[PDB]
Design a protein around this ligand. Structure first.
Ligand SMILES: Nc1nc2c(ncn2[C@H]2C[C@H](O)[C@@H](COP(=O)(O)OP(=O)(O)OP(=O)(O)O)O2)c(=O)[nH]1
Ligand SMILES: [Mg+2]
Ligand code: NA
Ligand code: NA
Ligand code: NA
Length: 325
DNA sequence: CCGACCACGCATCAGC
DNA sequence: GCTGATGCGA
DNA sequence: GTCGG
């Protein structure tokens, strides 16, 4: 908000590189810059000043001067004025449709919300669901609905086996008053790094949420990851709640912290920490934190009793979810 | 100044 | 089937 | 796009 104008500009650009130019690096570069800029406590007044920041090279400084000078950016005005791109970008907003398929479709003549439904026969199951709920998914979730959802999930879980521990991470755990979707970390004593003493541990919980009619659709589903859709039950004659994206990740309970850390994010906060990690000599991931060998091979996983333990290894002052972004 | 740039589960496809 | 890579969304 | 080997 302080540097909002800027970070929005950088954001839109980043999206154009990921969705059109299909260049994640330029995508990240732009994100990283917007990320460090959003953290900058001063109201920027030039590209010279901005560049001093890591992640802001000359190019971005140049655009910052233009924007600050004209209240806009020609490059962004052009892209916005080009139908092809605007259709591609548009298409990627459907769950299941990334840069690649979106482009193909604009090539195959499909480029409007109308075209898509008229060619459902071109979409796979997932992309199909992303289309059906397209409108619903564009919506952010009120923190109160989140709660009503967290409540339902934790109950049904207990109803399957009280050894299960379910935790809502993502932007929720970070204290957001709204969320894009719902991220659920799961754990059970019967599954650790040493062994899996039960079959269908994730399945028992998924099916339970469906039997109860909370889970409506399944984007994809393995033995540790579930991507689907759900909806809060609504009261008679009351417009129903938008369907929402929901993920449930089953982690070995002895790794609960690395995984909760990962799943709490943000994604950007994560990449940073992981970057810092490597700089301290470590390699982090939802599972463990291992020291790196000369060859580049990770050593045995180091013991962790808390998220802070992970920050300690990297020599970072603990940060409650609330300060991660 | 060229090249690397977090980490991974699930779906699918090419080569075998 | 498997490996390795693409694609997708984390 | 950056910045570091
Ligand atoms: N390390 C790493 N973690 C990621 C990446 N993308 C997402 N994540 C983690 C942190 C997230 O906070 C969780 C899933 O996150 P989301 O995309 O739902 O982010 P988040 O809930 O923070 O935003 P939201 O309010 O739901 O729109 O996976 C990534 O590229 N790298
Ligand atoms: Mg989320
Ligand atoms: Na800089
Ligand atoms: Na999409
Ligand atoms: Na999600």
């Amino acid at each position: 908000t302080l540097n909002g104008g800027i970070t929005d500009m950088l954001t839109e650009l980043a999206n154009f590189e990921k969705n059109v130019s299909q260049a994640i690096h330029k995508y990240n570069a732009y994100r990283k810059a917007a990320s460090v800029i959003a953290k900058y406590p001063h109201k920027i007044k030039s590209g010279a000043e901005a560049k001093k920041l890591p992640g802001v090279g000359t190019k971005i400084a140049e655009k910052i001067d233009e924007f600050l000078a004209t209240g806009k950016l020609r490059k962004l005005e052009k892209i916005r004025q080009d139908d092809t791109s605007s259709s591609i970008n548009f298409l990627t907003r459907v769950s299941g449709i990334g840069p690649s398929a979106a482009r193909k479709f604009v090539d195959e003549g499909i480029k409007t919300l109308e075209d898509l439904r008229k060619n459902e026969d071109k979409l796979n199951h997932h992309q199909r669901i992303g289309l059906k709920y397209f409108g619903d998914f564009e919506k952010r979730i009120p923190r109160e609905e989140m709660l009503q959802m967290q409540d339902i999930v934790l109950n049904e879980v207990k109803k399957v086996d009280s050894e299960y521990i379910a935790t809502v991470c993502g932007s929720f755990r970070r204290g957001a008053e709204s969320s894009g979707d719902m991220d659920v970390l799961l754990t059970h004593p019967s599954f650790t790094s040493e062994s899996t003493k039960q079959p269908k541990l994730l399945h028992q919980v998924v099916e339970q949420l469906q039997k109860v009619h909370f889970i409506t659709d399944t984007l994809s589903k393995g033995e540790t990851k579930f991507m689907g859709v759900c909806q809060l039950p609504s009261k008679n004659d009351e417009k129903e709640y938008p369907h929402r994206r929901i993920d449930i990740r089953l982690i070995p309970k002895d790794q609960y912290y690395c995984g909760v850390l990962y799943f709490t994010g943000s994604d950007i906060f994560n990449k940073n920490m992981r970057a810092h990690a490597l700089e301290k000599g470590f390699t982090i991931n939802e599972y463990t934190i291992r020291p790196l060998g000369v060859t580049g091979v990770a050593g045995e996983p180091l013991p962790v009793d808390s998220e802070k333990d992970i920050f300690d290894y990297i020599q970072w002052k603990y940060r409650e979810p609330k300060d991660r972004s």
